[PDB]
Amino acid sequence: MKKALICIDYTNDFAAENGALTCGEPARQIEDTIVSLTQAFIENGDYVVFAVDSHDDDFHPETRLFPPHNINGTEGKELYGRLSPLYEKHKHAKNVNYMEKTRYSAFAGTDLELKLRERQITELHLAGLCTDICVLHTAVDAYNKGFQIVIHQNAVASFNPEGHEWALSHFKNSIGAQVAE
């Protein structure tokens, strides 16, 4: 179908050794496949959204739960590893969108759905962090919005291995997505 890739929260703070909210080894371990995945989408001309947690704010629900992270302007928010130059190489491309988000789901309070419908996109490929938090919530919205969904299981990770497994099974058995190797 018409395809888009949503590349979620692959930042320093979520992957880096001293990431302010780091997921650690599982997150860095996917670096190579998510970079290839994204590059491939970009080069084939498919729509690619870098959906990135963005924080300035005692009104944000997460300020109760978590340390400061993915703060606007800081190195923690930058895309991790080889994904940062991939993006910098392509940030002007028509089929590349850098989209700041304020909740776990890439859809919530954003214009992602608007952009996807403009482009008549019908299949949404999901990659990034975490499998059972931002990828999950995104997939829940995608599901309830009627999109076909592809989870790239070697391009997602979580700190919690059980959550990771649980999520992949949820995507397969409840959401009816395709979980791709």
Add this chain to the structure above:
Amino acid sequence: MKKALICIDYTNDFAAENGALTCGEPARQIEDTIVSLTQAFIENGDYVVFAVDSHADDDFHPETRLFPPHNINGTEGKELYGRLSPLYEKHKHAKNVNYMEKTRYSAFAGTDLELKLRERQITELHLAGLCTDICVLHTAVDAYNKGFQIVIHQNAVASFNPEGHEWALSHFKNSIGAQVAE
């Protein structure tokens, strides 16, 4: 602040022994707690929504072909389980009681739940029912994105998957910021 209870898919098909999609005993073991909870809300005059899956002749529904028919209209599989059924029948006339059919996992999706919550100025959403890591989870994701305070009644939710159940309760507490009440 103003409270409502969303009592999710506590039906024969999801709880009974012979249920088309039963979670089995753990769904049956919460009957007393979920009935006491729901009755407490009803009698206190708080808003209560029985949110019930209603489907399976539509090859357009994502669920058909990929799940056996369940909570089908007219069938006693759709009936509330156990003592929840006579509680509902006794109060179904009440202004603070609503029966709401839903067609996806989340109680918000394609329903007028949010409309009704706004009208009643509900600020805090209490969730109970089945399954912890499916319908309860999807309802909670939506509730979270729509800005509600969320209370999960741990002893009034259950899943057919024990690992999913535990995972979900930590998710609600730690990611969604819900109160997980015991």
